[PDB]
Amino acid sequence: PETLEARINRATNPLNKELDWASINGFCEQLNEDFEGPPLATRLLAHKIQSPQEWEAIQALTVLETCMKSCGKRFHDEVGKFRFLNELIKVVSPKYLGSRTSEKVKNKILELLYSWTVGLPEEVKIAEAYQMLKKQGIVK
Amino acid sequence: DDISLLK
């Protein structure tokens, strides 16, 4: 089948007129079966989420959201590592990309993080990262 | 292994 990259470029393609739920699903599926899967997938979303093109970032976030909802224990491991949390922080923090980032994209990320501190207490690093955004005042 | 929390 198509590689993870090909799957993500379609799932987050700036030309999509609507969410490509098909290709998206295919993404969460494929990544959760390769040993190198999660780390790769995780690195790709990070880049997509930081795109200057909002629609490309919004879809990426939707993909991240989706794969996190499946019983993908492996995906939660990668997303739970600061190796990935830092990338989301760079997008919402003013000290980095936070300034040039759309309000829409930043608010979505904050909500995504919250929801995980709730349905995924098992992941402390997420709560840890989320907590820092609180102190900085990012979390109004 | 994992990097530290960004500042």
UniProtKB/Swiss-Prot annotation, chain A:
Changing residue 86 to A: Abolishes interaction with IGF2R. Residues 11-140 form the VHS domain. It is found in: Golgi apparatus, trans-Golgi network membrane; Endosome membrane; Early endosome membrane. Disulfide bonds: none annotated. Coiled coil: none annotated. Ubiquitously expressed. Phosphorylated by CK2 and dephosphorylated by PP2A. Phosphorylation of GGA1 allows the internal DXXLL motif to bind the VHS domain and to inhibit the recognition of cargo signals. Ubiquitinated. Monomer. Interacts with GGA2 and GGA3. Binds to clathrin and activated ARFs, including ARF1, ARF5 and ARF6. Interacts with RABEP1. Interacts with RABGEF1. Interacts with the type-I membrane proteins LRP3, M6PR/CD-MPR and IGF2R/CI-MPR. Interacts (via N-terminal VHS domain) with SORL1/sorLA and SORT1 (via C-terminal cytosolic domain). Interacts with EPN4. Interacts with CCDC91. Interacts with HEATR5B/p200a. Interacts with SYNRG/gamma-synergin. Interacts (via GAE doamin) with NECAP1 and NECAP2. Interacts (via GAE domain) with AFTPH/aftiphilin. Interacts with TSG101 and UBC. Interacts with RNF11. The VHS domain functions as a recognition module for sorting signals composed of an acidic cluster followed by two leucines (DXXLL motif). Belongs to the GGA protein family. Plays a role in protein sorting and trafficking between the trans-Golgi network (TGN) and endosomes. Mediates the ARF-dependent recruitment of clathrin to the TGN and binds ubiquitinated proteins and membrane cargo molecules with a cytosolic acidic cluster-dileucine (DXXLL) motif. Mediates export of the GPCR receptor ADRA2B to the cell surface. Required for targeting PKD1:PKD2 complex from the trans-Golgi network to the cilium membrane. Regulates retrograde transport of proteins such as phosphorylated form of BACE1 from endosomes to the trans-Golgi network. This is ADP-ribosylation factor-binding protein GGA1. It comes from Homo sapiens.
From Swiss-Prot, chain B:
There is a cross-link at residue 7 (Glycyl lysine isopeptide (Lys-Gly) (interchain with G-Cter in ubiquitin)). N-Glycosylated. Addition of a bisecting N-acetylglucosamine by MGAT3 blocks lysosomal targeting, further degradation and is required for maintaining stability under stress conditions. Acetylation by NAT8 and NAT8B is transient and deacetylation probably occurs in the Golgi. Acetylation regulates the maturation, the transport to the plasma membrane, the stability and the expression of the protein. A motif (DXXLL) lies at residues 2-6. It is found in: Cell membrane; Golgi apparatus, trans-Golgi network; Endoplasmic reticulum; Endosome. The modification Phosphoserine is found at residue 4. It comes from the Eukaryota. Changing residue 4 to D: No effect on endocytosis form the cell surface. Decreases recycling from endosomes to the cell surface. Expressed at high levels in the brain and pancreas. In the brain, expression is highest in the substantia nigra, locus coruleus and medulla oblongata. Changing residue 4 to A: No effect on endocytosis from the cell surface. Increases recycling from endosomes to the cell surface. Induction: Up-regulated by the Ca(2+)-regulated transcription factor NFATC4. Coiled coil: none annotated. Responsible for the proteolytic processing of the amyloid precursor protein (APP). Cleaves at the N-terminus of the A-beta peptide sequence, between residues 671 and 672 of APP, leads to the generation and extracellular release of beta-cleaved soluble APP, and a corresponding cell-associated C-terminal fragment which is later released by gamma-secretase. Cleaves CHL1. Belongs to the peptidase A1 family. DXXLL motif is required for a proper endocytosis and retrograde transport to the trans-Golgi network, as well as for regulation of lysosomal degradation. The transmembrane domain is necessary for its activity. It determines its late Golgi localization and access to its substrate, APP. Monomer. Interacts (via DXXLL motif) with GGA1, GGA2 and GGA3 (via their VHS domain); the interaction highly increases when BACE1 is phosphorylated at Ser-4. Interacts with RTN1; RTN2; RTN3 and RTN4; the interaction leads to inhibition of amyloid precursor protein processing. Interacts with SNX6. Interacts with PCSK9. Interacts with NAT8 and NAT8B. Interacts with BIN1. Interacts (via extracellular domain) with ADAM10 (via extracellular domain). Interacts with SORL1; this interaction may affect binding with APP and hence reduce APP cleavage. Interacts with NRDC AND NRG1. This is Beta-secretase 1. It comes from Homo sapiens.
